[PDB]
Design a binder for these strands. Structure first.
Ligand SMILES: N#C[C@]1(COP(=O)(O)OP(=O)(O)OP(=O)(O)O)/C(=C\F)[C@@H](n2cnc3c(=O)[nH]c(N)nc32)C[C@@H]1O
Lengths: 553, 406
DNA sequence: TCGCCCCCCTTCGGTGCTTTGCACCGAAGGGGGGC
């Protein structure tokens, strides 16, 4: 049926008119499948026949459903969408099973032909005009328009959701002790009523829905566990994901690998320890989806590691508001991090991973802070509060970080957990110059129009060095000069540069970088025992800085 | 009442800013607040055909343990027509910054008795979120002058002035300044005697519809150079580099007689004796930096900018300028909350106090350059906000080349 | 040959800097998943 709900008024973007697009061909089974529903949608009043002074058209086709014996109908409204007003989408996120509490009675329902039961604004219907082909050379097609929300229009999902929200509103307020998760047309209904009274309330809900024109077919009315919901299986005490099947190929293409990385990301929400770094690395620099990419040795290992993790069965548990949330993180290497969230030991609510490189130059402490922030945000979304953290970083390490780092930074209440490899600062710049250490006045000069440069140093004990640089930048020669001073100095060194650029990078104590030059500098900072790094202004005749600049000419 | 016609600026659309996640306690409070506002007609439930949105959240002081709804109309205010253009802005009194105490009052609720141009209401939409996304977002728009909208003080201006004039005449040496939803009221009396009349003011305000600030103790922190009788090559280098930076601000500062003691490729730890023609340079520039700078005047036609630097051990230095190196104010904020750890809470409190001083001094807030990663700030700042307004800000990473301010 | 939402990984192009490349950031390409 069609809901007696008031329509949502809709507009075209100012200045624009409706779509005018001729039809294309389709098959045996996708013209009967449409005429079967088109003449049937018309008998139900979903569509009306129109004619030639409606100047608009939009092509039509169909697509299979997981029903499989049923067909879904879709209209290529791409151009009408471009000319339809903007909408503010009300679906703000995806519900997750780890956010559910244990319920003594659970039901999952779906609405049948849900879009086709919400009416469309009267004045907008003429823009939804289409033509049904009938094997194409047969006949000139019949013209219809939509009286309900069509599948494929930009406005239909949001107008449906809002319409569903208004309809459920009376039932929710009258029954606050009943949890209703509303995702599109799928209704999860859990309660603490014994099953007798629970089915009473369900039948009450279904009857309210039907008065407003929403059917709930038996086919989609799950009454018993396990419940299939949002891609998961809901058991009384635990939940699983539906089986994740990974591609296995002799020859991989870029697109195959893109598919594989996506499945593993989806798996990481409950499978601990999933990694995708080495497999995603193959996607870099590639220039075609059909391009065959050979797996590197590291990618095969990572792939095999992931396959061993997925071979073992796993489950999440449900949320107990009477206990705290606990987040624990582990370092995995090359900027990869995995975590588990739980309330009792060895019973995960969910897992996840963080593996983004933010910025050209960073360290493990920064990334650990970003992992904590991602987890903290996820926790607000699912449970409405942040968790207590268990971090593999010592208190002295963190304390040293936020005192010698100039940006404000913070981590919530956390407890140190000894799960090596630990997060540490890999070197620390000395706060004051080192007595006995040699002093290097470094400088690097490049010419912007040439591409050629020089880097070098002079020294209080007496060393000088100039190396020519080819195809370099101003900033590279400055890093190059610092690189040489670390190269030629002992375990303790004082360095004075005139590049705020280079000082800024190094003073942040990076332990990884996208630049091989900065990585070379980092490897040398770690090998040293004491390093002091000082800045002076260039071109002011300051002794030491002046003569090295005098030399790099 | 008749609505005043309002427009967005030419060629601009309304705000389209996504809602961010909220804790359980803030969601419950917003739902409690808005359902009551819907009943009283101040807001109305809307759908998705309204293409606009502005983030909402809630703050609760332990100054008063009730939740206050806060809609971040920063984008909408940026795109709203000027009201000093149309003869309805509020002038700032230069007397407020000199009074013994200035108390701040939240008078935003008085706006809820004036209807907003129905053609403009659709730009005020916001969306309450859902824990675990159990439900789609719930959307509202205002029917009255919204709190946090810069147009509400302008449209309400003529009403508030008549609400206040009895108080203004019965107490002529008190100066009151309305900024956004706030009243900044100051005068020269005992703390008890200042609390006298602010509460007389509250009950006259209640008849129709937190901290005590003390402007005199807002010390300016100048640029200070170190003091000791023995100087190393590194000490002179850092000094020469600090004054070279200050030469872009102050006037007639020299480093010629300090630079060439460093002549040669000296070792950083070598103790260089000061010449007479160096101690001359240092003590001379030491005081060019004692009393502040000549020729820098506030321009109400330009934006105020604030820069903050973390200094460690709970201290934060700040400068407020409009053109670079022409500082109207430089200061240093301090904290002692008793937990002694949180950098983000400290900076959030530092921004509010700096922004409050700008309102007191100049009548508007500055745009902040915050020494923090965008994502670290956005993870935590709303947990410490206690103003009914929100200043503009951007995120910088400026490694401390000079630390002239400490 | 269709729609809306979240997530991750990579690429690209706009912006500001007392710059001449560089780092940051948002958007858009690809993939996963939901209905
Ligand atoms: N509401 C609703 C439903 C539920 O889609 P659902 O699987 O439950 O099927 P159904 O309700 O139509 O009918 P049924 O329950 O089987 O009797 C949708 C989202 F939530 C929409 N939708 C689903 N897939 C697609 C798709 O690919 N393209 C487009 N353009 N739209 C789709 C239409 C449908 O209306």
């Amino acid at each position: 049926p069609i809901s007696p709900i008031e329509t949502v008024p809709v507009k075209l973007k100012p200045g624009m008119d409706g779509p005018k697009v001729k039809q294309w061909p389709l098959t045996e089974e996708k013209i009967k499948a449409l005429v079967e529903i088109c003449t049937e949608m018309e008998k139900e009043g979903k569509i009306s026949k129109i004619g030639p002074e409606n100047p608009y058209n939009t092509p039509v086709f169909a697509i299979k459903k997981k029903d499989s014996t049923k067909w879904r109908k879709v209209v290529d409204f791409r151009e009408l969408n471009k000319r339809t007003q903007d909408f503010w989408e009300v679906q703000l996120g995806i519900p997750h099973p780890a956010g559910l509490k244990q319920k003594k009675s659970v039901t999952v329902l779906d609405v049948g032909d849900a879009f086709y039961s919400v009416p469309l604004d009267k004045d907008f219907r003429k823009y939804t005009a289409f033509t049904i082909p009938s094997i194409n050379n047969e006949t000139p097609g019949i013209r219809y328009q939509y009286n309900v929300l069509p599948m494929g229009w930009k406005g239909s999902p949001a107008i449906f959701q809002s319409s569903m929200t208004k309809i459920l509103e009376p039932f929710r307020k009258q029954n606050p002790d009943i949890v209703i998760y509303q995702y599109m047309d799928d209704l999860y209904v859990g309660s603490d009523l014994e099953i007798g009274q629970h089915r009473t309330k369900i039948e009450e809900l279904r009857q309210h829905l039907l008065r407003w024109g929403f059917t709930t077919p038996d086919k989609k009315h799950q009454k018993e566990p396990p419940f299939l919901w949002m891609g998961y299986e809901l058991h009384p005490d635990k939940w699983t994901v539906q089986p994740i099947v990974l591609p296995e190929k002799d020859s991989w293409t870029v697109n195959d690998i893109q598919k594989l990385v996506g499945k593993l990301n989806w798996a990481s929400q409950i499978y601990a320890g999933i990694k995708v770094r080495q497999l995603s690395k193959l996607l870099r620099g590639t220039k075609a989806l059909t391009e065959v990419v050979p797996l590197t040795e590291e990618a095969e290992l990572e792939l095999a590691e992931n396959r061993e993790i997925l071979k073992e069965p796993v489950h999440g548990v449900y949320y107990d508001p009477s206990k705290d949330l606990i987040a624990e993180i582990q370092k995995q290497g090359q900027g990869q991090w995995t975590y588990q969230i739980y309330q009792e030991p060895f019973k995960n609510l969910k897992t996840g991973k963080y593996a983004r490189m933010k910025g050209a130059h960073t360290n493990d402490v920064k990334q650990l802070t970003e992992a904590v922030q991602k987890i903290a945000t996820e926790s607000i979304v699912i449970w409405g509060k942040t968790p207590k953290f268990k971090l593999p970083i010592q208190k002295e390490t963190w304390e040293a970080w936020w005192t010698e780092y100039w940006q404000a930074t913070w981590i919530p209440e956390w407890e140190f957990v000894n799960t090596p490899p630990l997060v540490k600062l890999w070197y620390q710049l000395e706060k004051e110059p080192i007595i006995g250490a040699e002093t290097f006045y470094v400088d690097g000069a490049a010419n912007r129009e040439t591409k050629l440069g020089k880097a070098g140093y002079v020294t209080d004990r007496g060393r000088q060095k100039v190396v020519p640089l080819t195809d370099t930048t101003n900033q590279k020669t400055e890093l190059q000069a610092i690189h040489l001073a670390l190269q030629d100095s002992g375990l303790e060194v004082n360095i004075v540069t005139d590049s705020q650029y280079a000082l800024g990078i190094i003073q942040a104590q990076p332990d990884k970088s996208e630049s091989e030059l900065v990585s070379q500098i980092i490897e040398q900072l770690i090998k040293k025992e004491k390093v002091y790094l000082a800045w002076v202004p260039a071109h002011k005749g300051i002794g030491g800085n002046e003569q090295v600049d005098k030399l790099v000419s | 009442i008749e609505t005043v016609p309002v427009k967005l600026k030419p060629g601009m659309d309304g705000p389209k800013v996504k809602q961010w996640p909220l804790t359980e306690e803030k969601i419950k409070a917003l739902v409690e607040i808005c359902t009551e506002m819907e009943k009283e007609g101040k807001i109305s439930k809307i759908g998705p055909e309204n293409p606009y949105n502005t983030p909402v959240f809630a703050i609760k002081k332990k100054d008063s343990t009730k939740w206050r709804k806060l809609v971040d109309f920063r984008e909408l205010n940026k795109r709203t027509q000027d009201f000093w253009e149309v003869q309805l802005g509020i002038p700032h009194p230069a007397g407020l910054k000199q009074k013994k105490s200035v108390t701040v009052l939240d008078v935003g609720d008085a706006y809820f008795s004036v209807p907003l141009d129905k053609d403009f209401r659709k730009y005020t939409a916001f969306t309450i979120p859902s824990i675990n996304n159990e439900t789609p977002g719930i959307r509202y728009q205002y029917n009255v002058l919204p709190q946090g909208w810069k147009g509400s003080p302008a449209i309400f201006q003529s009403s508030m002035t008549k609400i206040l004039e009895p108080f203004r005449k019965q107490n002529p040496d008190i100066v009151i300044y309305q900024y956004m939803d706030d009243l900044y009221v100051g005068s020269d009396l005992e703390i008890g005697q200042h609390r006298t009349k602010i509460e007389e003011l509250r009950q006259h305000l209640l008849r129709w519809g937190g901290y005590e600030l003390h402007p005199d103790k807002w010390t300016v922190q100048p640029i200070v150079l170190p003091e000791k009788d023995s100087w190393t090559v590194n000490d002179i280098q850092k000094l020469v580099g600090k004054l070279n930076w200050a030469s872009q601000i102050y006037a007639g500062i020299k480093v010629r007689q300090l630079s060439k003691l460093l002549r040669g490729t000296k070792a950083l730890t070598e103790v260089v004796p000061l010449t007479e023609e160096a101690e001359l340079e240092l003590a001379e520039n030491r005081e060019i930096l004692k009393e502040p700078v000549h020729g820098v005047y506030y321009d109400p036609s330009k934006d105020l900018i604030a820069e903050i630097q973390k200094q460690g051990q709970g201290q934060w230095t700040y400068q407020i300028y409009q053109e670079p190196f022409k500082n109207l104010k430089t200061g240093k904020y301090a904290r002692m909350k008793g937990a002694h750890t949180n950098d983000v809470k400290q900076l959030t409190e530092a921004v509010q106090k700096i922004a409050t001083e700008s309102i007191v001094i100049w009548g508007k807030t500055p745009k902040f350059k915050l020494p923090i990663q965008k994502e670290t700030w956005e993870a935590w700042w709303t947990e410490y906000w206690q103003a009914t307004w929100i200043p503009e800000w951007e995120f910088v990473n400026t490694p401390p080349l000079v630390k002239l301010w400490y």
